Subunit: 172 residues, 2 copies
């Protein structure tokens, strides 16, 4: 099936990082895996015709919902982190995502309404490239948030209510 | 009383200040840059404004996009007459970007305009649509400002063809 390759590369990029660890006792890893799977589906949907537009809009809503889970948990990890340098960096990257995923919902709706003529091929190309660049930025930010959440867990001190499990998966 | 979006007006103001340095007499690039700067401030005023002015915002964007095209069209003609490769290529680089930004402006103005009438949409989401419009507005005025500057450099080194008049405005 045809698929928007720039979008697909971004989904695979996050998938590669998230796949390094088990989802078992790690909801950041589970949500990041959901996100990569949904974006990937999205690549197909943007590169599919109208009559599937409702799927494009719902897919962005699902990606935004899964990113809110990543943000919410990464904020809890940060609050339990000893190292100020890591805690601040995690808060910097994590806080930003909600804005990127809000922008994903806007641009998916924009792209979806142009799946149906009157609009120009230029507006259509530009709407795709805006969506592509936003998808890349979102996948990057979550990948960075996975990395820093792992880095921050090493620094947990004393007793913490919001703990996470980082178990590497078997290499081939 | 009417509210305004300060960064859009700041960007509009920035281009007006550059375009105001020269006379519109025999320079349709300075004339179009002047109309663009005037329209951008109006568009910014429109964005802050309530519903019932949405059409005004969509039309304003269309006008900015139309005025931008003339600069791209004229700057391409100035570039073809320019002797220096270094200036000719730099002038083609800046003016190439103008149509894609200007296309993205139309998209994001329509997006912003649709949300004016109803509150179904997230307040934060609306802020995101404004920020996107703001950044895009900033980028467009920057490119046009750079295009007007480089067109002046490309008029100096010319052989034997459209002619641009660069007459500086009187000082106080
Ligand atoms: O109505 C259209 C008109 C747009 O201006 P419009 O392009 O029609 O008319 C002339 C144009 O703006 C020139 O750029 C001005 O000269 P410059 O750049 O200063 O040399 C010239 O000034 P002046 O000739 O009156 O001095 C203007 O007459 O709207 C409003 O003015 C508002």
């Amino acid at each position: 099936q045809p698929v928007n390759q720039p979008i697909l590369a971004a989904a695979r990029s996050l998938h590669d990082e998230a796949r390094k660890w088990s989802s078992k006792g790690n909801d950041i890893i589970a949500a990041a895996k959901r996100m990569a799977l949904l974006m990937a589906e999205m690549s197909r949907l943007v590169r599919g015709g109208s009559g599937t537009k409702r799927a494009l809009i719902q897919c962005a809503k699902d990606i935004a919902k899964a990113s809110d889970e990543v943000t919410r948990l990464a904020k809890e990890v940060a609050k339990q982190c000893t190292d100020k340098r890591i805690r601040t960096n995690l808060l910097q990257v994590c806080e930003r995502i909600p804005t990127i995923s809000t922008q994903l919902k806007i641009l998916s709706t924009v792209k979806a309404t142009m799946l149906g003529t009157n609009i120009s091929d230029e507006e259509s190309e530009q709407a795709t490239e805006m969506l592509v660049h936003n998808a890349q930025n979102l996948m990057q930010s979550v990948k960075e948030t996975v990395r820093e959440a792992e880095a921050a867990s090493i620094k947990i001190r004393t007793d913490a209510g919001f703990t996470l499990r980082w178990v590497r998966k078997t290499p081939w």
